[PDB]
Amino acid sequence: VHATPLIRRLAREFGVNLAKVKGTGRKGRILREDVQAYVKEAIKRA
Amino acid sequence: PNDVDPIETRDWLQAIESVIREEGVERAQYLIDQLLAEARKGGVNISNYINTIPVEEQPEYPGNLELERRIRSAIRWNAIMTVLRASKKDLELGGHMASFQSSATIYDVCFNHFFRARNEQDGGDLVYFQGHISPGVYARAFLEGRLTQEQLDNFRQEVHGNGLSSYPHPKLMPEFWQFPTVSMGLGPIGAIYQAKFLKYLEHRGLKDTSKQTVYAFLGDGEMDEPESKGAITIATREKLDNLVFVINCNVTGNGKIINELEGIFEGAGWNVIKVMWGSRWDELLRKDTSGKLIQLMNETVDGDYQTFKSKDGAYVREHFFGKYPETAALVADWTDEQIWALNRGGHDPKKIYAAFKKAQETKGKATVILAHTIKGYGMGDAAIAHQVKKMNMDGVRHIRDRFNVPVSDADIEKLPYITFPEGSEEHTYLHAQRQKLHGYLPSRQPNFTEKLELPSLQDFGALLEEQSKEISTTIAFVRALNVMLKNKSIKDRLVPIIADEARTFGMEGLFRQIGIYSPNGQYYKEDEKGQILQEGINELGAGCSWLAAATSYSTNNLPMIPFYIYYSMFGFQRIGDLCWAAGDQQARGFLIGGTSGRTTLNGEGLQHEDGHSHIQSLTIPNCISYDPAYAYEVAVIMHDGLERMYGEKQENVYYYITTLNENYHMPAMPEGAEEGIRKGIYKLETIEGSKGKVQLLGSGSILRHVREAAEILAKDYGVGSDVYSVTSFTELARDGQDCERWNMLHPLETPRVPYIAQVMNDAPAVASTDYMKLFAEQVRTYVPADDYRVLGTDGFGRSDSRENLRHHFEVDASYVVVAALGELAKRGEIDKKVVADAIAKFNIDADKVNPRLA
Amino acid sequence: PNDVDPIETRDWLQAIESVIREEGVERAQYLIDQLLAEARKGGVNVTGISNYINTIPVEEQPEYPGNLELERRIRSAIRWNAIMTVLRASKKDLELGGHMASFQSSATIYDVCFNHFFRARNEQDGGDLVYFQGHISPGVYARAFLEGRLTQEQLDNFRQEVHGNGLSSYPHPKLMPEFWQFPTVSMGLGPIGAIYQAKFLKYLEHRGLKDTSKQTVYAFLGDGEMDEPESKGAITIATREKLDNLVFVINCNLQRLDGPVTGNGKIINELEGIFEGAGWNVIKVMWGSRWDELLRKDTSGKLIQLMNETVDGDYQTFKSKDGAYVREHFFGKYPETAALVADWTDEQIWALNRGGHDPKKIYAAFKKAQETKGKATVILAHTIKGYGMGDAAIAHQVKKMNMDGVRHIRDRFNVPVSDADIEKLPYITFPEGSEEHTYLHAQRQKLHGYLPSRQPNFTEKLELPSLQDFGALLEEQSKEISTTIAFVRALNVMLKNKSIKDRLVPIIADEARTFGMEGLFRQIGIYSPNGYKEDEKGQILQEGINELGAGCSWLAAATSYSTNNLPMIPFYIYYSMFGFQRIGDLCWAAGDQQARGFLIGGTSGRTTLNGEGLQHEDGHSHIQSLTIPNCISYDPAYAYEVAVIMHDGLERMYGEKQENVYYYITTLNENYHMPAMPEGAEEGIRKGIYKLETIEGSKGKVQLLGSGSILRHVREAAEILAKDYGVGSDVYSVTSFTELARDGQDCERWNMLHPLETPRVPYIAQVMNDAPAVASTDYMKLFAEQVRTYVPADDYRVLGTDGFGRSDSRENLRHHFEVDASYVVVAALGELAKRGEIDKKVVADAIAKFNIDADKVNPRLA
Structure with missing residues (x-):
């Protein structure tokens, strides 16, 4: 699992498991947009 | 073209900023050190070559800097005068000058603001002064009125009692010096366990030593001694926040000894304080937005720093500041004399004070102060002060000028001492600072109350x-x-x-x-x-x-x-x-x-x-x-x-x-053996024997074997003996040497008899110990017998039973018997065949190699 | 606290590890430099202690080149014969001694080395220079015996070497000049010796005297020995002198001989900290392979955190107990770590091994050390004190006829010894034609022969x-x-x-x-x-x-x-x-x-x-x-x-x-x-004494002895005695009082052991005569007094410099220590006055004339 310490800190605050989100970054890095897309799809599960 | 990926870097840089909000600086450092350790295993990769304490965090200097330089300049002068006057004698006396010149300001700040003398609560600060700076300590003690001009004139001439020791030697000056440091490497390790012992006294509730500080003053060269850094992890283990190592860095060619010392001491868990640059650098460092001056300071090595201490201001402008346009602009408006005046940290009292104050405040670990100084500071080109014997005086002239010493050109050949009279600003200040710090240092109490x-x-x-x-x-x-x-x-x-x-x-x-x-x-x-x-x-x-x-x-x-x-x-x-x-x-x-x-x-x-x-x-x-x-x-x-x-x-x-x-x-x-035990020898027993008489001496584990031989000699050979327990062959040799020295120096007087010659008699004697032959042989001159045969364990040790090693080293009962019979056979008291038969009987190999050569 | 927030630390350390999986090392360095540059709104520093796990991950671990099952069989025989040697010595009840626990904890480390790294003496060089731990000597003897270099007779005479058919307790070349090479049992002397040995090999290459490039200096140490100032006091020299031919192997069984080294702390972290700060390459061999999945599968990083916070004390306590204890007191600290072993049995938890017992982990460390250039490598190997001994580490119960300890060791290492033969304490050997004999010798032949071995002379x-x-x-x-x-x-x-x-x-x-x-x-x-x-x-x-x-x-x-x-x-x-x-x-x-x-x-x-x-x-x-x-x-x-x-x-x-x-x-x-x-003085100079001069004198005769700087003063005194007192003398230069005392001691030893033969005369008694003698040196009186027994004169007065030194002129010091010409004259006249050859008043008068204070304190007490 490849992510910046900013995205890793963002995932711990919102309770996002970065092993459950696919990264579309430079070398498969999980970006801010990737975590946003994962949270957006999880809200639909209501 | 710049680089690659700008956002990723934006995330990394902003995340460390959002660490200084979640109480960073200390938290930020812990994260950087653990990121750097995990980077090492991956294949990647010490602080900047500047002061640890920035001006922003520097305390206000409490002293009167002008009065202090006047007092320090008289200490500097009297230290040089003491050594030069001793040199004039041409008696190969010795003494150093360059060492104290580089560290004078470090000791001065301490004497004026930190060193606590012996007081009401505790013994005060325990200072391990560099041995070589002793003329500097004597010069201050003289200004304090604790030493006379007569004593200074007898520096390194102490046999006749009116002089001073070369270095800190309490045995020679028992009311002045406290801790020996000349033998390099012994001061730093001694100081570590001294600081540890003060903590032991507090925890055991025997003495409140909490306000005491152990100062170990060292040179960068002394640090090469295994004893100097071999025990520095103990200060971290034992949380010795009462220990301060002061290393005067004026050793490693291409590399930087300041970075080597910082690396190992930081890795050993110590708090490292670098005193690199003086106050004049602060204007340049603070105005530099590019960080090119710090970069320039970092890339310049130890070898290149002593090249820039033997040129001029014009050189520095071009071969240091001229290395980058940013750094050249910093001093563009400065004169060559202004550039040349830029000072090293260990020569600035403001920077020195800040380091000793931060050390005093630091808790849980020991502190090491790395002070950057100039070797043979203010001495010009004599670093060759042998020129006084040639009558040059231009070197003495230079140091008088350099430190504005109140000595005329005419009086300079007299090599005069400087004093501050009662009532003067300097005399008042010198004493006032020491009175605030509970008195004079160093001083020693020879006895406990x-x-x-x-x-x-x-x-x-x-x-x-x-x-x-x-x-x-x-x-x-x-x-x-x-x-x-x-x-x-x-x-x-x-x-x-x-x-x-x-x-x-x-x-x-x-x-x-x-x-x-x-x-x-943490049965x-x-x-x-x-x-x-x-x-x-x-x-x-x-x-x-x-x-x-x-x-x-x-x-x-x-x-x-x-x-x-x-x-x-x-x-x-x-x-x-x-x-x-x-x-x-x-x-x-x-x-x-x-x-x-x-x-x-x-x-x-x-x-x-x-x-x-x-x-x-x-x-x-x-x-x-x-x-x-x-x-x-x-x-x-x-x-x-x-x-x-x-x-x-x-x-x-x-x-x-x-x-x-x-x-x-x-x-x-035995009743009354107390004196004999203490003095070194006493008669244990007298065994009867009609065929002859011997004296048998033993000590330690081998005595019982000597005693066994006395029984053999009596039962099997009819030889009687005087058996002696020798508790100290050394104290008996010393007593003997003393009596003979006295007898030599008193030829008109009845000779004194050594204690061993009082206890013993004229009968042939045999001695055996678990130590080499010289241990028992040392009393020979004082043994009153014609024959005194010594058995001992000369030679390298080896693994075996006690029985086999006692036969090998030729010290057991059988060798004592053969040695005793051999003396009596020489005296004609017994046949030579008896001795030769005993050698065979006791399975002694008379032709085995000497245990010393085995 | 000491952690603040360890979950945030996991995120940061997991970010740079993932950056290295994103064409790192180069990208990782650029990011670290931009990070540290941004630390402008904060501070900067050097300690840098890594996690309490292996330095070399499985991913980067090389393929083990040896036959692990054959090696395990050979190693068990070495283990057994080492224990047998010590136990057989113990049975004698002669307080011989010997260690067992020490070699048990480090056996696998030495084994990997003997099978794959240690180069023996060869044609090009003297091979690898190994500073073996002194205490593991029965382990070296046990291997040498299996190699057929030592006999059963020698093993049975372990620590019984006086009669020549035995073995030394520790590495002593003087005692075993064809086997041992470097003394190490005096702790602290091996690591510093090894540093300067490695430096010397580089000196020989640079000076073009010998190609030492293929030689490696191995210094095998214990964690307790590291407390010696000599052990770490010279470690910055290895960095300065770029000693990539030096390897320090520290066996961290977290104990010494009287408990742990640092119970409240972590000796492996202390060692890593100082060695890393000293510029060395640090390789930690912490955990065996049984731990690899647990670590790989732990996303929480709670196991690594638990491993980091647990101190040496806790780890010692743990290995003294059982699997049930480890489950509660180690893994039970966190729900994440408790879940990891929730389905594991106590026996399964207890099986988890330490790095220093895993040949695969040990090999990886020695291979990475071999590859490292520009600096020296320290290998920190984590082992168990008294490994496979089952608490009784008290195995000298064999005197009580209790073999319950011997049986356990036999069982633990699957030793081919029957229950009946166990009381005989037998040695194990691999015969010619066996898989083990072949393999044992084949590995050493590839590595140029047997180690240790010594050449007593140069060719x-x-x-x-x-x-x-x-x-x-x-x-x-x-x-x-x-x-x-x-x-x-x-x-x-x-x-x-x-x-x-x-x-x-x-x-x-x-x-x-x-x-x-x-x-x-x-x-x-x-x-x-x-x-x-x-x-x-x-x-x-x-x-x-x-x-x-x-x-x-x-x-x-x-x-x-x-x-x-x-x-x-x-x-x-x-x-x-x-x-x-x-x-x-x-x-x-x-x-x-x-x-x-x-x-x-x-x-x-x-x-x-x-x-x-x-x-x-x-x-x-x-x-x-x-x-x-x-x-x-x-x-x-x-x-x-x-x-x-x-x-x-x-x-x-x-x-x-x-x-x-x-x-x-x-x-x-x-x-x-x-x-x-003087013509013909060569023999006398070598032997220790020779007559320099004979000065004529009608009023009496003396002998005057001197050495070093004080001889010219005795010679001065000889001129004074002759001119002013008419006393003649034999003046002697004593080049060695020690060699003369040794020669004397030798002659008297011989005379004692040969009572039927004519006595031999010591060389000093051959050169000297019966005339009263005075000796003066710049050394304490015992230096000259040591020849007393062998000096053929009735009177032999010795002057010396007993007492603490002080600062003064050479003249003032020579009068103070009472060794100058004036004291030699007063000593000489005093002997002749006792003999009645001169009046007692002449000696008295000389004391006053030469300004001698007869009542000053003894220089020894001054």
Whole structure:
């Protein structure tokens, strides 16, 4: 699992498991947009 | 083209910013150090070459800088005058000047604002001054009115009593110097265990030493000594926030010694404070937005920094600041003289003060101050001050000019001392600063004030009687400790020190009873109130704990009685220079050479079998050495030592007792043997024999074999004997040497008879010990017999049974018998065939190689 | 606290690890530099301790090249025979000793090395130089026995070597000169010795004397031994001198002999911190393979956190208990770590192994050390104290006829010994044609043979300089010189000899100006391969303020004749006081290692180094040096004596005799008249004494003895006695009081053991006569008094420098220590007055005339 310490800190605050989100970054890095897309799809599960 | 990926880097840089909000700086440093350690394993990769304390965090200097430079310039001058006047004598006296010139300002800030002299609460700060800066200490003491011009004029001429020692030697100046430091490497390790000992006294509730600081002043070159950095992790383990190492960096060619020292001390858990640049650099450093000056400072190496100390301001502008346009712009408006005036940190009192203040505030670890100075500062080109003998004077002229010394051109050839008169601004200030810091430093109290109610010899009672079971002299030693641990006056003053192996010396009994000192928070006691000092596989560290305890009577007016037990081989042989420094520091304690004797520690071999520590120990003038054979001898020797050192006599002497790991019959003390035991020899027995008479001497484990030979000589050969227990061959040789010295110098007077010649008679004598032949041979001149044959364990040790090693080293009962019969055969008292038959009978190989050559 | 937030630390450390999986190392460095640059709004620092896990992950671990099952079988036989050797010695009930627990914890570390790394002595070089832990010697003997190098007879005589059919307790080359090479049982001396051994091998290559490039110096240490100042005090030298030929193997069983090293802390972190800060490559071998999945599968990082926070104390407690205890007190600390082993059995948890017991983990460390360049590597191996012994580590219950401990060890390591044969304490051997015998020998043949082994002598023939080659030193000196000037001139004579010139190793501990060595600096250079004629081809070794370091360079050079079959002649000059007193234990180890070189105690004598005082004035180094059986000590007074002594030393040690002895010569910083050598004095100079002169006198006769700087004062006293008192004398130069005492002791030992034969006369009793004698030296009275028994005179008065030194002129010190001409005269007249040859008033009057204070305090007490 490849992510910046900013995205890793963002995932711990919102309770996002970065092993459950696919990264579309430079070398498969999980970006801010990737975590946003994962949270957006999880809200639909209501 | 710039780089690759700008966002990722934006995330990384902003995340460290959002760490300084979640209480960073300290949290940010912990994250950076753990990120750097995980980076190392991946294949990646010390602070900047600038001051640790920025101006922003620097305290206001409390002193009067102009008055202080005036006083310091007179200390500098009188230090140079002392050495030059000694040099004029042309008696090869010696003395250093460059060393004190580079560190004068460091010591000055300390004397004016930090060093606490002996006071009401404690012994004050314990300073390990660099040995070589002694003329600087004397020059200040003279200005303070503690030393006379006559004393200064007799620097390094102390035989006739009106002079000064070359270096810090308490034995020579017992009211002035406190800690020997000349022998490099011994000061830093001594200071580590001194600081540790002060913590031990507080935790044990014996003295509030909390306001005390141990200062160890070192040079960068001295740091190459294994002893200088070999024990620095102990300061971190024991949280010695009462220890300050001051390293004067004026050693490593291409590299930087300041970075080597910072690297190892930081890795060892110490707080490192770099005092790199003086206040003049601050204008340039603060105006530099590019960070090019810090970069320039970092890339410039040690070798290139001493090249820029032998040119001019125009050079520096071009070959330093001229390296980058950013740095060239910083001094574009500066003159060459203004650039040349840029100072090193260790020469600026403001930077020096900030370091010592931050050290004082730091808790949980020791601090190391790395001070950047100039070698032979303000001396110009003499670094060659031998030119005074050639009558040049241009060098003296230069230092007078450099430090604006109030000495005329005419008076300069007289080499005059400078003084501040009563009533002057300088005299007032000099004394006022020291009075605020509780008086003068260095100073020493030669004796302790309290009266200890020591145990009597009768208190050892049971040891003086016959033993029910076979025991060793090490068991006897531990039982004497238990007797002292019952005495209300000295029980909590005893400092048992062990260098790992406790099981070997049967100390595990005491572990439950008094505990092991452990100042940290984790069947027997292992807490901060623990009395025993466990130092691990570290004889030098244990010796340094022993030295601090043994000199506590003077340092803190708190007598502490240490007992350091270890494998005898790793005493004087391994920590010999520390035992010399201990003698010099007037140490009062006991060194217990356990598992001693070449043949007794039988299975251990070459590097453990000690048959010579007594030959090493006899070289120390104030070390009293004994090799007792019986338990009662141990009790009498230990009681006398205690009374001599910690009784009202207060004898500046320390004891060395070799103890054994072999058990045998321990008889009762003969009535009146006390004097003989203490003096070194006493007649144990007289065995009857009609065919002849001999004298048999023995000590330690070999005495019982000498006693066995006396029975053989009587039963099998009809040879009678006078059997003697020699508790100290060394004290008997010293007594003999003393009587003969007296007899030589008093030719008109009746000669004095050595104590050994009073106890012994003219009958042929044989001596046998577990030590080399010289141990027993040393009394030859004073033995009143025609023949005195000595048996000993000369040669390298080896592994075997005690029986086989005693035959190999030719010291057993059979060799004593053959030696005795041989003397009587020479005298014609017995046939030569008797001796030749005994050699065969006792299975002695007369033609085996000399054990020394084996 | 000590962690603040360890979950945030996990995120940061997981971000750089993932950056390295994103074409890192280069990208990782650029990000770390931009990170640290941004630390402008904060601070910067060097400690840097990594996680309490293996340095080398499985991903980067090389393929194990050996046959693990065959190796396990061979290792169990080594383990068994090591335990059998010690137990059989114990059965004798002779307090012989021996260790078992120590080798049990480190057996697998040595095994991987013997099977895949240790190079034995070969054609190109002396192979790998291994500093084995002293205590693991039964393990080395047990392997040597399986290799067929030692017999069962030798194992049965372990620690019973007096009768020649046995084995030494520890590595002692003097006792086993064809087996052991480096003494290590005196802790702390092995690591510092190894540092300067590695440095010396580089010196031989740079100087073009031997290609030592394929040799590695291995120093095997225990974590407790690291407390010795000598163990870490010189570790920055390995970084300075780029010693990538040095490997420190620290066995961290987290204990010493009286409990743990640092219970409240973590000795592996302390060692990693200081060694990393000292510029070394640190490789931690923490956990075995049974831990690999647990670590890989743990996303929480709670196991690594738990591993980091658990102190040495807890880890010791854990291995003293059971699997049930570890589940609750280790893994039970966190829900994440408790879940990891929730389905594991207590036996399954207890099976989790330490790195230092896994050959795969050990091999990876030694391979990465082998690859590392520019610095030395320290391997921190995590092991269990008394591994596979089952608490009783008390296995000397065999005397009680209890073999329950022996059975457990047999079971634990699946040893092929029956229950019936276990009481016999049998040795195991692999026969010719067995898989194990073949493999055991095949691995060692690939690595050029057996280790350890020693060559007692060098093969080449050196064409040494003659005594006549020193020529000018044997003649009278034009100007006043010192015996240190004489020493440097003798070096120049040897630097002219084609055979030994490039073999000379002059070693100096900083202060070269004091010993006038600055001349040689521009002639032969200072060895400086990293940082004037200071280059890699430099011949002089300058070691700075570091006597022990210089002594360790001297020891490496003095034993190069054996280690590399390359005789090197070292000359270590230093302040005499900081010799045997300061590096004494190294001088004993040098004896054991059969060192052949010269120790030059410069600025010697109590009164001669006059201004320096108490901690410099040496009047006793000769009393310390005489305790070493194979040290030959001299205190020459004249320049020709220095030449004769140095020539003889060279001939004895590096000539065809090849004498396992080393020399100690005290030299001086005082200049005086140096006369020519008397015809035929060569034998007397070498042996220790010779008659210099006979001065005529009608009123009586005395014998006057002197050495070093004080001889010229005794000679002055001889002129005074003759001119003013009419007393004639025999004047003697005593070049060695110690060699004369040893010769005397030898003759008397022989005379004692041969009562039916004519007694042998000591050499001093052959040279000297019955006339009253006076001796005076710059050393304490015992130096001259030691020959008393062998001096053939009724009276033998000794003057010496007993007592602490102090600062003054040489004149004032010589009067204070009562050794000058005035005290020699008063001592001589006093003997003749006792004999009735002169009046007692003449002695009295002399005391007043010579300004002698008869009642001043004894210099020993002053």
